[PDB]
Structure formats: structure tokens, C-alpha cells
Amino acid sequence: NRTIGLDVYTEVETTTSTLKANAGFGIFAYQTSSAGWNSEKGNTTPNFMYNEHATWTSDSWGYTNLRFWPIDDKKITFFAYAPYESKPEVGTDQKITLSGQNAKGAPTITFEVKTSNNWKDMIDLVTDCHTAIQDQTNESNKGTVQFKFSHVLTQIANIKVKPDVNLGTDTKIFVTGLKLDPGSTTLYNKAVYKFDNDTWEAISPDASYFSTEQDLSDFLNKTTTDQWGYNKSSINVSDDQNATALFSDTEALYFIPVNNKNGTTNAGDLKLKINYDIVTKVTDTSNLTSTITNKEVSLPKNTFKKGTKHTYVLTIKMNAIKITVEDNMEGWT
């Protein structure tokens, strides 16, 4: 056989099910001689596939413009990204701009972070530039290109809060607001992802940053409250034993990472601004509320790491001003 088969590797919800349900993915393919990709990439353009739309139809992955493996000893190098962008010149669908059809070498992506619909529309940009899909022939893997997508952004999986002591029965803490303070020259809102070495760099000639406080209050999983007259839309974070989540189970933030896999250089390069109420019972229908707003919380160094899931656990110290942070990290797989 000579037709090119597609497969997407499934990890032990999966990335694959998301691609199957949504827009699928896009493929770049560069045909070289037997000499290979590293020898010839410098003067090779995506001459075989340029943003080829790969979609799932019932039980298999397919593409419309059919292509065949070479009859001779020529090789094909593949790259892939997701979610697919149907307007790659402007980034209508995903705010993804691709390197041109006549650009030489490994491709690039210019990506902008989607802040619309209260952060609920952010794209989980995945790419594939692993060597096992480079220098492929019909004999490489039974004529099938197996893609393995990696998360190239940073995930803020959750922000959890708890007091440092048990508040007893007559006092509760409610979180009502949260902002991210990105500094002025730290967090990119627009950046270039390079498939050559799987790294992010600034846009040219001038870097594009988040330089103002970003309000996350409507992103938070706030619910109605009716506690001793207190009825502000909030999250009860009173449990001292287990920190209470501010994001819902299905919601997370996906940002262009800071310093790629290294994260922030210093503690407080990135900060949080939190609002919370300490409610003490007076009667069943009345209370005393202590409202703290715009309280600064510095995030630790080596945070917002590429390919990492970060969960921040905030401990509100009841005998002081202080809010201390734990950056719990996981590999984003």
C-alpha cells in the first residue's frame, strides 16, 4: 500500500477525545530526499502538506487532499498542532497564525491568549514536533503517521484557599474576587512558538505583554450564599483541613509560559489580588463581616512553567496580614 494513514496517540478526558469532538488538527509535511530533514530543512518548505485538516470520522482519522508515500527513497517530515485553524493567515478560529506556505525550515505559530467570555474560551494549544514523525517512509511505521501531542502552554489547574486554624462554628471565610497581576514585562499575551526546538519567543520587533491586572472574579465558581444575613455571591473556603477550590472541576487557565520550562525568574514576578470576607455570627439573621479587598499575594519563583499544571494553595494566616502560597506542580500529560 502507498496511502498515508493517520493516528493520534492516546495517553493512559484525553487530548484525542477533545480533537475528535472539536476541530481535529492541522498537519505540516516536508518532503526531502533520503539525505534527510536535519541535512535539508534549511531550504525545504512545507511542500507536501500545508495545514492539512485532519478530522475523525466514526472510527478513523482522515484528510480530504489525498497524498501517497513516495515510490522512491524520499522521506517525509511531519509536524502538527491543535485545535485546527481554518484561517491561518489571521487566526479567526483559535487566534493561531501560521508560518507561510513558502517559509523554509520547521514551522512557527504566532499565538494570542483568548481573554473573552470570562476566560472560558482559552485555547489549550497542543503541538507535535517529536523526531519519530520526522524522516518517515512507507516502512517507518506500517505507512501510518502516529502523532503525539504535547501541551506547550502553562496550566493554572486551580487556586485553593484555607485558613491556618479551625474557625469554629461561628466564623466563615468567603472568597469574592481574584485578579492576576502580571507585572509589566513578564507574561506574554502574544508570542511565537518554534517547532525547531519546541520553545516560545517574543513577537518581533516588540514583545507583547499582559501589563495590567487581569480580573478573574467571574471565572471563579462562585455560588449564592445565605449565612447569618451574609448573601454575597462567593466561595466558602472555611475548611482548615482541606483547601477549597476557586475554579470548577472542568475549568482551568492556559497561558503562554514564562521562560519556557523554567518559569518566573523571581517570587512576585507574578502576583494574585484576592478579595475575601470573614463573617462572624451575631444572630441567625445578622453578622459582623470583615471585608479585605485587593490583598496582594506573591506567586513563587519557577512558576508558569511550560508543560506544567500549577495548583496554588493559599493559607490565610488568622493571627497576621500574611497569605502564604504553595505551588503544587504536575506534568501536564
Which of 194, 203, 77, 193 has the alpha carbon at shortest distance from 131? 77
Find the binder of Cl ion among 70, 91, 183, 307 (CB under 5 A).
183
Find the binder of Cl ion among 10, 212, 262, 294 (CB under 5 A).
212
Closest to Cl ion by CB, 183 vs 307, is: 183
Rg (CA), the chain: 24
Please work out the total of residues on this chain that contact Cl ion, with binding judged by CB under 5 A. Answer: 18
Q: Rounded to 10 degrees, what is the CA torsion of 35, 39, 40, 42?
A: 180
CA 284 to chain centroid, in Å, comes to: 44
Which residue is at the shortest CB distance from Cl ion?
A: 183
3-state secondary structure string across 190-242: EEEEECCCCEEEECCCCCEECCCCEECCCCCCCECCCECCECCCEEECCCCCC
CA 208 to chain centroid, in Å, comes to: 18
Binders of Cl ion in range 139-158 (CB under 5 A): none
Give the contact letters, 254-273, x = binds to Cl ion (CB under 5 A), - = no. Answer: ------------xx------
Find the binder of Cl ion among 223, 241, 283, 285 (CB under 5 A).
223
Find the binder of Cl ion among 197, 224, 250, 319 (CB under 5 A).
224
Please tell me whether residue 186 binds Cl ion under the rule CB under 5 A: yes
Q: Beta strand pairing status for 108-112 and 150-151?
A: unpaired
Please tell me whether residue 116 binds Cl ion under the rule CB under 5 A: yes
Compute how many other C-beta atoms are within 10 angstroms of the C-beta atom of residue 57: 9
Angstrom distance (rounded) from CA 145 to CA 141: 7
* End-to-end CA separation in angstroms for the chain: 34
Compute how many other C-beta atoms are within 10 angstroms of the C-beta atom of residue 246: 23
Please tell me whether residue 213 binds Cl ion under the rule CB under 5 A: yes
Please tell me whether residue 239 binds Cl ion under the rule CB under 5 A: yes
Please tell me whether residue 241 binds Cl ion under the rule CB under 5 A: no
Among the listed ranges 60-68, 106-114, 122-130, 148-156, the one in contact with Cl ion (CB under 5 A) is 106-114
Q: State the nearest-atom distance from the C-beta of 119 to Cl ion, in Å.
A: 10
Please tell me whether residue 294 binds Cl ion under the rule CB under 5 A: no
DSSP 148: -
Closest to Cl ion by CB, 75 vs 179, is: 179
Find the binder of Cl ion among 215, 301, 307, 313 (CB under 5 A).
301
Closest to Cl ion by CB, 176 vs 238, is: 238
Which of 222, 214, 316 has the alpha carbon at shortest distance from 271? 214
Closest to Cl ion by CB, 64 vs 116, is: 116
Please tell me whether residue 290 binds Cl ion under the rule CB under 5 A: no
Binding interface with Cl ion (CB under 5 A) = 114-116, 183-186, 212-213, 223-224, 236, 238-239, 244, 266-267, 301
